[PDB]
Amino acid sequence: GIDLRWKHVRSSHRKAPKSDNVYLKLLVKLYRFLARRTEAPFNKVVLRRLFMSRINRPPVSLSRIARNLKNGNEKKTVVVVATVTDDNRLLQVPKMEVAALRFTAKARARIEAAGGRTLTLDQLALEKPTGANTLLLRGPKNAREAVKHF
Amino acid sequence: VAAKKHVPIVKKRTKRFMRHQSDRFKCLDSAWRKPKGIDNRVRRRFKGNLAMPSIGYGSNKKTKHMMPSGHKAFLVHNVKDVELLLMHNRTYAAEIAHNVSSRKRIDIITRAKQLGVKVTNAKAKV
């Protein structure tokens, strides 16, 4: 026998989505290829967030996107691996180019009316395959009733 | 026809795993059941007792599910089933299901002879 005081640890992170969405499966295949064949850390982060669950993907509002568009970020492509929601407290939506998993109808309509562009992640892979000139945004993770009651 | 060339087939254990005390009680079937008594000698693995199945007895991945001729059994019910083995006569053999009638068996055997497919029970119902 061998004396192993320490213990080899199995991985504690997701390697595949639990979702049976076939479009998400195709997106996972695409970003697996991209993260394997490119040196960009952006593709690895995007693939690992595509693995994640819904409580680990909180929504991002247009007010949050407009907040992060300030100070020289007006021309960067906004990348959100989550749902982009509308905020009616924000009366004036600036022009922006956002790629997301999905948009709400009001958020998509308000972006297109303000003159920006909405993209999917495969369109993001086509136009910025290495994630150049991109602003990666996450929503508030701890802003949940369960997390408040923890 | 003859099977594709393969590594020699090795069975790590030929004898079956018999249930404890199934040789002494007729109400106990000889099918394996893992002993769960905390004082059971077979569960505690004393020497001179029945062996317990484990994954270390597993067969080689290259020869698993191979009959001694080197083929893998494929259960067939009709001529359309046996024609699925057109491209695998050196890897899969055909085995006619038990509830297939004699005349349909003759049809399957004739088609399998044309396709060069081994039939495991070709002498049945003759």
Binding site: G1, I2, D3, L4, R5 | -
Partner: protein, 149 residues
């Protein structure tokens, strides 16, 4: 085994019986080996012992994996920044205890030896000076290396 000798064996990378390591003699190592004397036999290996151990049972730790030292290219990729590009360089560094002895010894996987041909002494778990096998047998470790290699 008590926790302190267990920890010292874990730090000396002696986790299995008949595992062997090369140690550079300082006070900080000699005191550890003196503590774990009831479980180990140690001594001063010669050039023949070093070269035969490295040639027959030499394994390098590459990306956490145990790779046999069958080519000089493995030694070049994993020790070439210290000037060790061949197995003769590795043997020289281990034998002469050079400036990169720590890197060479830690690159060497702990040697998994067999039981000795001819056996141990009749009572194995006494000190060497009492007629046993434990402790420092000095230059007599070479015969044990021949028997267990």
């Amino acid at each position: 085994i008590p926790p302190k000798p267990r920890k010292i064996l874990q730090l000396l990378r002696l986790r299995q019986i008949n595992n062997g390591v090369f140690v550079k003699v300082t006070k900080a190592t000699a005191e550890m080996i003196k503590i774990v004397e009831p479980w180990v036999a140690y001594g001063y290996p010669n050039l023949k012992s070093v070269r035969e151990l490295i040639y027959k049972r030499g394994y390098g730790k590459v990306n956490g994996q145990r790779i046999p030292l069958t080519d000089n290219a493995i030694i070049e990729e994993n020790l070439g920044k210290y000037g060790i590009i061949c197995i003769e360089d590795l043997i020289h560094e281990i034998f002469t205890v050079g400036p990169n002895f720590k890197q060479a010894a830690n690159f060497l996987w702990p040697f998994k030896l067999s039981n000795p041909n001819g056996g141990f002494r009749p009572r194995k778990f006494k000190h060497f000076i009492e007629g046993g096998d434990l402790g420092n047998r000095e230059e007599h470790i070479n015969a044990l290396i021949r028997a267990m290699n």
